[PDB]
Coordinates of C-alpha atoms and ligand atoms in Angstrom, one line a residue:
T5 CA -29.1 -0.2 -17.5
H6 CA -28.1 -3.7 -16.2
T7 CA -29.3 -4.8 -12.8
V8 CA -27.0 -6.9 -10.6
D9 CA -26.6 -7.9 -7.0
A10 CA -23.1 -6.4 -6.4
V11 CA -20.6 -4.1 -8.0
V12 CA -16.9 -4.5 -7.2
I13 CA -14.6 -1.6 -8.0
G14 CA -10.9 -2.7 -8.5
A15 CA -9.2 -5.9 -9.7
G16 CA -6.3 -5.9 -7.3
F17 CA -6.0 -8.5 -4.5
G18 CA -9.0 -6.8 -2.9
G19 CA -11.4 -6.8 -5.8
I20 CA -10.3 -10.3 -7.0
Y21 CA -11.2 -11.8 -3.7
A22 CA -14.3 -9.8 -3.2
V23 CA -15.7 -11.0 -6.7
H24 CA -14.8 -14.6 -5.7
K25 CA -16.7 -14.4 -2.4
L26 CA -19.7 -12.6 -3.5
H27 CA -20.2 -14.8 -6.6
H28 CA -19.1 -18.4 -5.4
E29 CA -19.9 -18.3 -1.7
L30 CA -22.9 -16.0 -1.8
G31 CA -24.3 -16.8 -5.4
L32 CA -24.8 -13.1 -6.1
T33 CA -24.7 -11.7 -9.7
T34 CA -21.5 -9.6 -9.5
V35 CA -19.6 -7.4 -11.9
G36 CA -16.2 -5.9 -11.3
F37 CA -14.3 -3.0 -12.9
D38 CA -10.8 -1.7 -13.4
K39 CA -9.3 1.1 -15.4
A40 CA -6.5 -1.3 -16.0
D41 CA -6.5 -3.6 -19.0
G42 CA -6.2 -6.7 -16.8
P43 CA -6.1 -7.7 -13.1
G44 CA -3.3 -7.1 -10.6
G45 CA -4.0 -3.5 -9.3
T46 CA -0.8 -2.3 -7.8
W47 CA 1.2 -5.0 -9.7
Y48 CA -0.4 -4.0 -13.0
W49 CA 0.6 -0.3 -12.6
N50 CA 4.0 -0.3 -10.9
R51 CA 6.2 -1.9 -13.6
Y52 CA 9.2 0.2 -12.7
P53 CA 12.5 -1.4 -12.7
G54 CA 13.3 -3.0 -9.3
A55 CA 9.7 -3.2 -8.1
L56 CA 9.8 -5.7 -5.4
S57 CA 7.6 -6.6 -2.4
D58 CA 8.9 -6.1 1.1
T59 CA 6.7 -8.9 2.4
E60 CA 8.4 -12.3 2.1
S61 CA 7.2 -14.2 -0.9
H62 CA 5.5 -17.0 1.0
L63 CA 3.2 -14.5 2.8
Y64 CA 2.6 -12.0 0.1
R65 CA -0.4 -13.9 -1.3
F66 CA -3.7 -15.3 -0.5
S67 CA -4.1 -17.8 2.3
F68 CA -7.7 -18.9 1.8
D69 CA -7.1 -21.8 -0.7
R70 CA -5.0 -24.5 0.8
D71 CA -4.3 -26.2 -2.6
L72 CA -3.2 -23.0 -4.3
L73 CA -0.7 -22.5 -1.4
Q74 CA 0.9 -25.9 -2.3
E75 CA 1.0 -25.2 -6.0
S76 CA 2.6 -21.7 -6.2
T77 CA 6.4 -21.3 -6.5
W78 CA 8.8 -18.5 -6.3
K79 CA 12.5 -17.8 -7.0
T80 CA 13.7 -15.7 -4.1
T81 CA 12.8 -14.7 -0.5
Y82 CA 10.9 -11.6 -1.8
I83 CA 8.8 -11.5 -4.9
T84 CA 9.1 -9.1 -7.9
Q85 CA 6.4 -7.3 -9.7
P86 CA 6.2 -9.6 -12.8
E87 CA 6.0 -12.6 -10.4
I88 CA 3.1 -11.1 -8.4
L89 CA 1.3 -10.0 -11.5
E90 CA 1.5 -13.6 -12.8
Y91 CA 0.3 -14.9 -9.5
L92 CA -2.7 -12.7 -9.5
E93 CA -3.5 -13.5 -13.2
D94 CA -3.3 -17.2 -12.2
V95 CA -5.8 -16.6 -9.3
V96 CA -8.2 -14.9 -11.7
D97 CA -8.0 -17.9 -14.1
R98 CA -8.0 -20.6 -11.4
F99 CA -11.3 -19.4 -10.0
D100 CA -12.9 -18.4 -13.3
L101 CA -13.2 -14.7 -12.3
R102 CA -12.2 -13.1 -15.5
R103 CA -15.7 -13.1 -16.9
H104 CA -17.0 -10.9 -14.0
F105 CA -14.6 -8.1 -14.8
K106 CA -14.9 -5.2 -17.2
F107 CA -11.3 -4.1 -17.8
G108 CA -10.2 -0.8 -19.4
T109 CA -13.3 0.5 -17.7
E110 CA -13.2 3.2 -15.0
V111 CA -16.2 3.7 -12.6
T112 CA -17.0 7.4 -12.8
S113 CA -19.9 7.8 -10.5
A114 CA -21.8 5.8 -7.8
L115 CA -25.0 7.3 -6.6
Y116 CA -27.4 5.9 -4.0
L117 CA -31.1 6.1 -4.8
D118 CA -32.9 6.4 -1.5
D119 CA -36.4 5.4 -2.7
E120 CA -35.2 2.3 -4.8
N121 CA -32.5 1.3 -2.2
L122 CA -29.9 0.8 -4.8
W123 CA -26.7 2.1 -6.1
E124 CA -26.4 3.5 -9.6
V125 CA -22.9 3.0 -10.9
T126 CA -21.7 4.5 -14.2
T127 CA -18.6 3.8 -16.3
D128 CA -16.5 6.0 -18.5
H129 CA -18.0 4.0 -21.6
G130 CA -21.6 5.2 -20.4
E131 CA -22.7 1.8 -19.2
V132 CA -25.0 2.1 -16.1
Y133 CA -25.4 -0.7 -13.5
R134 CA -27.8 -0.8 -10.6
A135 CA -26.7 -2.8 -7.6
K136 CA -27.8 -3.6 -4.1
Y137 CA -24.2 -3.6 -2.8
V138 CA -21.1 -1.8 -3.7
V139 CA -17.7 -3.1 -2.7
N140 CA -14.9 -0.6 -3.2
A141 CA -11.4 -2.1 -3.5
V142 CA -9.8 1.0 -5.0
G143 CA -6.3 0.7 -3.3
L144 CA -4.8 2.7 -0.5
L145 CA -1.6 3.4 -2.6
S146 CA -3.1 3.9 -6.0
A147 CA -4.1 7.5 -6.6
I148 CA -0.8 8.9 -8.0
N149 CA 0.9 12.0 -6.5
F150 CA 2.6 14.0 -9.2
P151 CA 3.9 17.4 -8.1
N152 CA 4.2 20.4 -10.5
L153 CA 7.7 21.9 -10.8
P154 CA 8.1 25.3 -12.2
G155 CA 8.8 25.0 -15.9
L156 CA 7.9 21.2 -16.0
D157 CA 5.8 21.6 -19.1
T158 CA 8.8 23.1 -21.1
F159 CA 10.7 19.9 -20.6
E160 CA 11.4 18.2 -24.0
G161 CA 12.3 14.8 -22.5
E162 CA 10.0 12.2 -21.2
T163 CA 8.3 12.3 -17.8
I164 CA 7.2 9.1 -16.0
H165 CA 5.6 8.4 -12.7
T166 CA 6.7 5.1 -11.3
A167 CA 3.1 3.9 -10.6
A168 CA 2.3 4.5 -14.3
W169 CA 5.4 2.9 -15.8
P170 CA 4.6 1.6 -19.3
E171 CA 5.3 -2.1 -19.6
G172 CA 8.6 -2.6 -21.5
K173 CA 10.0 1.0 -21.1
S174 CA 13.8 0.9 -20.4
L175 CA 16.0 3.9 -19.6
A176 CA 19.2 2.1 -20.5
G177 CA 21.9 4.3 -21.9
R178 CA 19.9 7.5 -21.0
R179 CA 20.6 10.5 -18.7
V180 CA 17.9 10.2 -16.0
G181 CA 16.7 12.1 -13.0
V182 CA 14.7 10.7 -10.1
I183 CA 12.6 12.8 -7.8
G184 CA 11.8 10.8 -4.6
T185 CA 13.6 8.6 -2.2
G186 CA 10.9 6.6 -0.4
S187 CA 10.4 2.9 -0.9
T188 CA 9.8 3.3 -4.6
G189 CA 12.6 5.7 -5.3
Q190 CA 15.2 3.6 -3.6
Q191 CA 14.2 0.6 -5.7
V192 CA 14.2 2.4 -8.9
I193 CA 17.5 4.2 -8.2
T194 CA 19.2 0.9 -7.2
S195 CA 18.0 -0.8 -10.4
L196 CA 18.7 2.1 -12.8
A197 CA 22.1 3.0 -11.6
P198 CA 23.9 0.1 -13.4
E199 CA 22.2 0.8 -16.8
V200 CA 21.8 4.5 -17.2
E201 CA 24.5 6.7 -18.6
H202 CA 24.1 9.2 -15.7
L203 CA 21.7 9.3 -12.8
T204 CA 20.9 12.4 -10.8
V205 CA 18.9 12.0 -7.6
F206 CA 16.9 14.9 -6.2
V207 CA 16.6 14.0 -2.5
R208 CA 14.5 16.0 -0.3
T209 CA 14.4 13.8 2.8
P210 CA 16.9 11.0 3.1
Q211 CA 15.3 8.0 4.8
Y212 CA 16.5 5.1 7.0
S213 CA 16.8 1.8 5.2
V214 CA 18.2 -1.6 6.0
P215 CA 19.1 -4.5 3.7
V216 CA 16.3 -6.5 2.3
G217 CA 18.3 -9.8 2.2
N218 CA 16.6 -11.1 -0.9
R219 CA 18.2 -14.5 -1.3
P220 CA 17.6 -17.3 -3.9
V221 CA 15.3 -20.0 -2.7
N222 CA 15.6 -23.6 -4.0
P223 CA 12.5 -26.1 -4.4
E224 CA 13.4 -27.6 -0.9
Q225 CA 13.3 -24.6 1.5
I226 CA 10.0 -23.9 -0.1
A227 CA 9.0 -27.5 0.6
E228 CA 9.5 -26.9 4.4
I229 CA 7.4 -23.8 4.2
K230 CA 4.7 -25.6 2.3
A231 CA 4.8 -28.4 4.9
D232 CA 4.2 -25.9 7.7
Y233 CA 1.8 -23.6 5.9
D234 CA -1.1 -24.0 8.3
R235 CA 0.9 -22.8 11.3
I236 CA 2.6 -20.1 9.3
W237 CA -0.8 -18.5 8.5
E238 CA -2.2 -19.1 12.0
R239 CA 0.7 -17.1 13.5
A240 CA 0.5 -14.4 10.9
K241 CA -3.1 -14.0 11.6
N242 CA -2.4 -13.7 15.4
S243 CA 0.4 -11.2 15.1
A244 CA 0.4 -7.4 14.8
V245 CA 1.9 -7.0 11.4
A246 CA 1.8 -10.5 9.9
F247 CA 5.2 -10.3 8.3
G248 CA 6.1 -13.9 9.5
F249 CA 8.5 -13.1 12.3
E250 CA 7.8 -12.9 16.1
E251 CA 7.2 -9.3 17.1
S252 CA 9.5 -8.6 20.0
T253 CA 8.4 -7.5 23.4
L254 CA 11.9 -6.8 24.6
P255 CA 12.5 -3.2 25.6
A256 CA 15.6 -1.8 23.8
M257 CA 17.1 0.0 26.8
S258 CA 16.6 -3.0 29.1
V259 CA 19.7 -4.7 27.6
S260 CA 23.4 -3.5 27.4
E261 CA 24.8 -1.5 24.5
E262 CA 26.9 -4.5 23.4
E263 CA 23.8 -6.7 23.2
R264 CA 21.7 -4.0 21.6
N265 CA 24.3 -3.7 18.8
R266 CA 24.4 -7.5 18.4
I267 CA 20.6 -7.7 18.1
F268 CA 20.6 -4.9 15.5
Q269 CA 23.5 -6.5 13.6
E270 CA 21.7 -9.9 13.4
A271 CA 18.6 -8.1 12.1
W272 CA 20.7 -6.1 9.6
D273 CA 22.4 -9.3 8.3
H274 CA 19.2 -11.1 8.1
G275 CA 17.3 -8.4 6.3
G276 CA 13.9 -6.8 6.2
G277 CA 12.6 -3.4 7.2
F278 CA 9.8 -4.4 9.4
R279 CA 11.9 -7.1 11.1
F280 CA 14.4 -4.3 12.0
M281 CA 11.7 -2.1 13.5
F282 CA 9.6 -4.8 15.2
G283 CA 11.6 -8.0 15.2
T284 CA 14.4 -6.6 17.3
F285 CA 12.9 -4.8 20.3
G286 CA 9.3 -4.1 21.2
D287 CA 9.5 -0.3 21.8
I288 CA 11.3 1.3 18.8
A289 CA 7.9 2.8 17.8
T290 CA 6.9 4.0 21.2
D291 CA 10.0 5.0 23.2
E292 CA 12.3 7.9 22.2
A293 CA 15.5 6.3 23.4
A294 CA 14.8 3.0 21.8
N295 CA 14.0 4.8 18.5
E296 CA 17.3 6.8 18.7
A297 CA 19.3 3.5 19.3
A298 CA 17.8 2.0 16.1
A299 CA 18.3 5.3 14.2
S300 CA 22.0 5.6 15.3
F301 CA 22.7 2.1 14.3
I302 CA 21.5 2.7 10.7
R303 CA 23.3 6.2 10.5
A304 CA 26.5 4.5 11.4
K305 CA 26.1 2.0 8.6
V306 CA 25.4 4.8 6.1
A307 CA 28.6 6.5 7.3
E308 CA 30.6 3.3 6.6
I309 CA 29.0 2.7 3.2
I310 CA 29.1 6.0 1.5
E311 CA 32.8 6.9 0.9
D312 CA 32.6 10.6 0.1
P313 CA 31.8 12.6 3.3
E314 CA 29.9 15.3 1.4
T315 CA 27.8 12.7 -0.4
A316 CA 27.2 10.9 2.9
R317 CA 26.1 14.1 4.6
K318 CA 23.5 14.6 2.0
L319 CA 22.2 11.0 2.3
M320 CA 22.4 10.8 6.1
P321 CA 19.0 10.1 7.5
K322 CA 18.0 12.4 10.5
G323 CA 15.3 12.5 13.1
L324 CA 12.8 9.9 14.2
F325 CA 13.0 6.4 12.6
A326 CA 9.2 6.8 12.1
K327 CA 8.3 6.4 8.5
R328 CA 7.4 3.1 6.9
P329 CA 10.6 1.1 7.5
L330 CA 12.6 0.7 4.2
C331 CA 14.8 -2.0 2.9
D332 CA 17.0 -2.2 -0.1
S333 CA 19.3 -4.2 -2.3
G334 CA 22.3 -1.8 -2.3
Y335 CA 20.8 1.7 -2.3
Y336 CA 23.4 3.6 -0.3
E337 CA 26.3 1.9 -2.2
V338 CA 24.9 3.5 -5.5
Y339 CA 26.2 6.9 -4.4
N340 CA 29.8 5.6 -4.6
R341 CA 29.3 5.2 -8.3
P342 CA 30.9 7.7 -10.6
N343 CA 27.8 7.9 -12.8
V344 CA 25.5 8.9 -9.9
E345 CA 25.0 12.4 -8.4
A346 CA 23.0 13.3 -5.4
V347 CA 21.4 16.7 -5.3
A348 CA 20.2 17.7 -1.8
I349 CA 17.1 19.9 -2.7
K350 CA 16.4 21.2 0.9
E351 CA 19.8 23.1 0.6
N352 CA 20.1 23.5 -3.2
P353 CA 16.4 23.7 -4.3
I354 CA 15.1 23.2 -7.9
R355 CA 14.9 26.6 -9.6
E356 CA 13.1 25.3 -12.6
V357 CA 12.9 22.7 -15.3
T358 CA 13.9 23.8 -18.8
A359 CA 13.9 22.1 -22.2
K360 CA 17.0 20.0 -21.5
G361 CA 16.7 19.4 -17.8
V362 CA 16.5 20.6 -14.2
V363 CA 18.2 23.7 -13.0
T364 CA 19.1 24.1 -9.4
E365 CA 19.5 27.4 -7.4
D366 CA 23.2 27.1 -7.6
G367 CA 22.9 27.9 -11.4
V368 CA 23.6 24.3 -12.5
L369 CA 21.7 22.5 -15.3
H370 CA 21.4 18.8 -14.7
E371 CA 21.0 17.7 -18.3
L372 CA 18.4 14.9 -18.5
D373 CA 16.7 12.8 -21.1
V374 CA 14.1 11.5 -18.7
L375 CA 12.6 12.6 -15.3
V376 CA 11.2 9.9 -13.1
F377 CA 8.8 10.9 -10.4
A378 CA 8.8 8.6 -7.5
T379 CA 6.7 11.0 -5.6
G380 CA 4.2 8.6 -4.1
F381 CA 0.5 8.6 -3.7
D382 CA -2.6 10.4 -2.4
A383 CA -2.9 7.5 0.0
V384 CA -6.0 5.9 1.6
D385 CA -8.8 8.3 0.6
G386 CA -7.4 9.6 -2.8
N387 CA -9.3 7.3 -5.1
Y388 CA -12.6 7.9 -3.3
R389 CA -12.2 11.7 -3.4
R390 CA -11.6 11.5 -7.2
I391 CA -14.9 9.6 -8.0
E392 CA -18.4 11.1 -7.9
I393 CA -19.8 9.2 -4.9
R394 CA -23.0 10.3 -3.3
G395 CA -24.9 8.7 -0.5
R396 CA -28.2 9.3 1.2
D397 CA -29.9 12.4 -0.1
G398 CA -27.0 13.1 -2.5
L399 CA -24.4 13.7 0.1
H400 CA -21.0 13.8 -1.8
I401 CA -18.2 11.7 -0.2
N402 CA -16.2 15.0 -0.2
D403 CA -18.8 16.8 1.9
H404 CA -19.2 13.7 4.2
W405 CA -15.5 13.5 4.7
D406 CA -15.3 17.4 4.7
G407 CA -12.1 17.2 6.9
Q408 CA -10.5 13.9 7.6
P409 CA -11.7 10.7 6.0
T410 CA -13.4 8.4 8.5
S411 CA -14.9 4.9 8.7
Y412 CA -16.4 2.5 11.0
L413 CA -14.0 -0.4 11.2
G414 CA -12.2 0.5 8.0
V415 CA -15.0 -1.0 5.8
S416 CA -18.0 1.4 6.1
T417 CA -19.1 5.0 6.6
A418 CA -22.2 6.8 7.8
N419 CA -24.7 8.0 5.1
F420 CA -23.5 5.3 2.6
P421 CA -25.7 2.3 3.1
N422 CA -24.8 -1.1 1.6
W423 CA -21.5 0.4 0.5
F424 CA -18.2 -1.2 1.8
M425 CA -14.6 -0.4 1.5
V426 CA -11.6 -2.7 1.3
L427 CA -8.6 -0.9 2.8
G428 CA -10.6 2.2 3.5
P429 CA -9.6 4.9 6.0
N430 CA -8.9 3.7 9.6
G431 CA -8.2 0.0 8.9
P432 CA -5.2 -2.1 9.8
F433 CA -1.5 -1.4 9.0
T434 CA 0.0 -4.8 8.3
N435 CA 1.2 -7.1 5.5
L436 CA -1.9 -6.3 3.5
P437 CA -3.1 -9.5 1.8
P438 CA -4.2 -11.1 5.2
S439 CA -6.0 -7.8 6.2
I440 CA -7.7 -7.7 2.8
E441 CA -8.8 -11.2 3.4
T442 CA -10.1 -10.4 6.9
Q443 CA -12.1 -7.4 5.5
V444 CA -13.4 -9.3 2.4
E445 CA -14.5 -12.2 4.5
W446 CA -16.2 -9.9 6.9
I447 CA -18.0 -7.9 4.2
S448 CA -19.1 -11.2 2.5
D449 CA -20.5 -12.5 5.8
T450 CA -22.3 -9.2 6.3
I451 CA -23.9 -9.3 2.9
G452 CA -24.8 -12.9 3.3
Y453 CA -26.4 -12.2 6.6
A454 CA -28.3 -9.3 4.9
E455 CA -29.6 -11.4 2.1
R456 CA -30.6 -14.3 4.4
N457 CA -32.3 -12.1 6.9
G458 CA -34.2 -9.7 4.4
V459 CA -32.2 -6.6 5.5
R460 CA -32.8 -3.7 3.1
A461 CA -29.9 -1.5 4.2
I462 CA -27.0 -1.5 6.6
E463 CA -25.0 1.6 7.6
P464 CA -22.9 2.6 10.6
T465 CA -24.3 5.2 13.0
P466 CA -22.4 8.5 13.4
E467 CA -21.7 7.7 17.0
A468 CA -19.9 4.4 16.2
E469 CA -17.9 6.0 13.5
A470 CA -16.8 8.9 15.8
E471 CA -15.8 6.3 18.5
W472 CA -13.8 4.4 15.9
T473 CA -12.0 7.6 14.9
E474 CA -11.2 8.3 18.5
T475 CA -10.0 4.8 19.1
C476 CA -7.6 5.0 16.1
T477 CA -6.4 8.4 17.3
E478 CA -5.6 7.2 20.8
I479 CA -3.6 4.3 19.6
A480 CA -1.8 6.5 17.1
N481 CA -0.9 9.1 19.8
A482 CA 0.8 6.5 21.9
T483 CA 3.4 5.8 19.1
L484 CA 6.1 8.0 17.5
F485 CA 4.5 7.6 14.0
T486 CA 2.5 10.7 14.6
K487 CA 5.8 12.7 14.1
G488 CA 7.1 10.9 11.0
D489 CA 5.7 13.3 8.5
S490 CA 4.8 11.0 5.7
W491 CA 1.9 9.6 3.6
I492 CA 0.8 7.4 6.6
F493 CA -0.7 10.5 8.3
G494 CA -1.7 12.4 5.1
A495 CA 1.2 14.8 5.5
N496 CA 2.8 14.4 2.0
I497 CA 0.3 16.3 -0.2
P498 CA 0.0 20.1 -0.2
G499 CA -3.6 20.9 0.6
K500 CA -4.4 17.5 2.3
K501 CA -5.4 17.8 5.9
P502 CA -3.0 15.6 8.0
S503 CA -5.0 13.0 10.1
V504 CA -4.9 9.4 11.4
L505 CA -5.5 7.1 8.5
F506 CA -4.9 3.7 10.1
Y507 CA -5.9 1.6 13.0
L508 CA -2.5 0.7 14.5
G509 CA -3.6 -2.0 16.9
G510 CA -2.4 -4.8 14.7
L511 CA -4.1 -7.6 12.8
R512 CA -4.8 -9.8 15.9
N513 CA -6.7 -7.0 17.6
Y514 CA -8.4 -5.9 14.4
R515 CA -9.7 -9.4 13.7
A516 CA -11.0 -9.8 17.3
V517 CA -12.9 -6.4 17.0
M518 CA -14.4 -7.4 13.7
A519 CA -15.5 -10.9 14.8
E520 CA -17.1 -9.4 18.0
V521 CA -19.0 -6.8 16.0
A522 CA -20.5 -9.5 13.8
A523 CA -21.2 -11.9 16.8
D524 CA -22.9 -9.1 18.5
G525 CA -25.5 -8.5 15.6
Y526 CA -23.5 -5.8 13.9
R527 CA -23.1 -3.4 16.9
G528 CA -22.7 0.2 15.7
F529 CA -24.7 -0.4 12.5
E530 CA -28.2 0.7 11.8
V531 CA -29.9 -2.2 10.2
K532 CA -33.2 -1.7 8.3
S533 CA -35.4 -4.7 7.5
Ligands
FAD164 C1 5.4 -0.6 -5.3 C2 4.5 -1.1 -4.2 C3 5.0 -2.1 -3.4 C4 4.2 -2.6 -2.4 N1 4.7 -3.6 -1.6 C5 3.9 -4.2 -0.6 C6 4.3 -5.2 0.3 O1 5.5 -5.7 0.2 N2 3.6 -5.7 1.3 C7 2.4 -5.2 1.5 O2 1.7 -5.7 2.3 N3 1.9 -4.2 0.7 C8 2.6 -3.6 -0.3 N4 2.1 -2.6 -1.1 C9 0.7 -2.2 -0.8 C10 -0.1 -2.8 -1.9 O3 -0.8 -1.9 -2.6 C11 -1.1 -3.9 -1.3 O4 -0.3 -5.0 -0.9 C12 -2.1 -4.5 -2.3 O5 -1.5 -4.7 -3.6 C13 -3.4 -3.6 -2.4 O6 -4.3 -4.3 -3.3 P1 -5.8 -3.7 -3.4 O7 -6.6 -4.7 -4.2 O8 -6.3 -3.4 -2.1 O9 -5.6 -2.3 -4.2 P2 -4.7 -2.1 -5.6 O10 -3.8 -3.2 -5.9 O11 -4.1 -0.7 -5.4 O12 -5.9 -2.1 -6.7 C14 -6.8 -1.0 -6.7 C15 -7.4 -1.0 -8.1 O13 -8.5 -0.2 -8.2 C16 -8.6 0.4 -9.5 N5 -9.4 1.5 -9.4 C17 -9.3 2.5 -8.5 N6 -10.3 3.4 -8.7 C18 -11.1 3.0 -9.7 C19 -12.2 3.4 -10.5 N7 -12.9 4.5 -10.2 N8 -12.8 2.6 -11.4 C20 -12.2 1.5 -11.8 N9 -11.0 1.1 -11.2 C21 -10.5 1.7 -10.2 C22 -7.1 0.7 -9.8 O14 -6.9 0.9 -11.2 C23 -6.4 -0.4 -9.1 O15 -6.1 -1.4 -10.1 C24 2.9 -2.1 -2.1 C25 2.4 -1.1 -2.9 C26 3.2 -0.5 -3.9 C27 2.7 0.6 -4.8
NAP165 N1 7.4 -3.2 -0.8 C1 8.2 -2.2 -1.2 O1 9.5 -2.4 -1.1 C2 7.6 -1.0 -1.7 C3 8.0 -0.3 -2.8 C4 7.4 0.9 -3.2 C5 6.3 1.3 -2.5 N2 5.8 0.6 -1.4 C6 4.7 1.2 -0.6 O2 4.2 2.4 -1.1 C7 4.4 3.5 -0.1 C8 4.7 4.8 -0.8 O3 6.1 4.8 -1.2 P1 6.7 5.7 -2.3 O4 8.2 5.7 -2.3 O5 6.0 5.6 -3.7 O6 6.1 7.2 -1.8 P2 6.6 8.0 -0.5 O7 7.1 7.1 0.7 O8 5.4 8.9 -0.4 O9 7.8 8.9 -1.0 C9 7.7 10.0 -1.9 C10 9.1 10.6 -2.1 O10 8.9 11.7 -3.0 C11 9.4 12.9 -2.3 N3 8.6 14.0 -2.8 C12 7.2 14.1 -2.7 N4 6.9 15.3 -3.3 C13 8.0 15.9 -3.7 C14 8.3 17.2 -4.4 N5 7.3 18.0 -4.7 N6 9.6 17.5 -4.6 C15 10.6 16.7 -4.3 N7 10.4 15.5 -3.7 C16 9.1 15.1 -3.4 C17 9.2 12.6 -0.8 O11 10.0 13.5 -0.1 P3 9.6 13.9 1.5 O12 9.9 12.6 2.2 O13 10.6 15.0 1.6 O14 8.2 14.2 1.4 C18 9.7 11.2 -0.8 O15 11.1 11.0 -0.9 C19 5.6 2.9 0.8 O16 5.8 3.6 2.1 C20 5.2 1.5 0.8 O17 4.2 1.4 1.7 C21 6.5 -0.5 -1.0
ECE166 O1 4.1 -1.7 1.9 C1 3.2 -1.8 2.7 C2 1.9 -1.0 2.5 C3 1.5 -0.1 3.6 C4 0.8 -0.7 4.8 C5 1.5 -1.9 5.3 C6 3.0 -1.9 5.0 O2 3.3 -2.7 3.8

């Protein structure tokens, strides 16, 4: 039983920064934990081939330390998993953080002790810590989703989830199946196709994707970025999604067809999924006709790329362009390869997995050495629901969030005093590092304020929390993303109640809300002295 000021759960971007603020700016005794053997979070787990950010390299990082920003370098316009991991290990060493963390150590329970006004946190090695504050940075795309298939456990080959890819494992020369064609599946398929002996893709919902445009960067282009870094970050912080481009306000149907095509073509040539969805016109996410113009443009490209009409039919995206926008380094062109087969599982479902592979309902065995599951995540709330977390009077997080998960401001919830979340439910949907920093900075200020002012507990009221839920819901219902049927609204997991899970007002609005709450003496919080 060690006693400390603060516990941080997670050693991704969130947890790394939170330990830094709580320790060096607030002078609090702070311990961090990760199940992982080192820092990096997402970029520690997802070592699958092709893993690559869709935020441009110069913005997928911390902004808080002006010297670090001048020191870091990168090879290309987007940054790969090993490069991000190295960046994060460098942050941890640069700021002497490593000593706060217990790696290979899962937090298994966190229990609030009403009389003592402390959290009791236990690890899977039986260590017990008591803390005044808990900061949860457990990842909104971290709890793996791994569907059961009939017969899966008779399979004699290897099975791998992409977000648990063992470092070093290569599938070169093997016969491989991939289940999943979201952001991960596209990357893994594109990068496996040239090295595997045969690839079979099991596609349930083909998605819309545009080119990433990942180009080599020399040490000069990067010099110009580094020379304007202050303004770069100021604009990012004052945009909606903080991806580094100007979010358009131009309505798509207010220009001619010719011009519309030209604007989409320029975005397509330039690259980037978010730029396609938000850099071109201002209403692709809120107006049906604007959505359909963007969708048709992409469908027409698929048609020109994939040469076999039957293959193209199976890969043709349909319906609203309303999932997380995807981009790729040659995904659709993979299906022109003779060692790649697409299996459209909505029309030819999986019958079962047997010793040697996957059998479809047409009676064909797809013979496979390895099955890769790019089946995504129990997003946002999944890592909370899996830990034993109990608040005031032993209320379990799963009974508190008995239906949808909720927060006040994305960083707190009622009945859990002195307990904060980084990227909890109902927070911003943006390039995430600058949102993580907004939240960590705001939590650190709040804890600092509590310590200075002798506050014993802070927690949001149920009224404020309900208002925040309603605000998220209203903003969501004004967009088409409601009908996209993906992880973003909890619709990807059998047994998960679909719900709003994000505040979609953008980083500029989010930051203004957060700063006003703090300037106003923590409006919506109950504060006990
Ligand atoms: C393949 C991939 C690509 C992505 N690309 C982008 C992108 O381009 N742009 C973008 O903005 N976002 C992207 N994301 C989202 C990305 O997760 C965030 O950018 C960011 O890495 C989140 O960092 P985090 O610290 O909040 O959580 P994570 O990096 O998910 O770290 C959470 C950590 O908590 C640990 N943990 C959880 N529960 C426990 C427990 N009980 N005890 C101990 N440890 C625990 C986990 O092991 C994990 O290491 C991507 C995600 C994935 C999976
Ligand atoms: N920066 C990047 O380039 C990058 C890369 C990877 C991940 N990410 C982030 O991580 C998020 C999640 O991405 P992801 O691709 O891992 O997950 P995802 O978008 O949730 O996609 C999961 C895929 O698995 C399929 N699937 C799920 N269950 C299945 C089942 N039982 N049988 C057959 N198919 C099944 C889904 O089909 P349906 O659509 O039919 O459900 C979908 O194609 C992304 O949206 C993005 O935010 C980003
Ligand atoms: O890939 C990501 C993570 C989901 C939320 C913002 C979009 O960028």
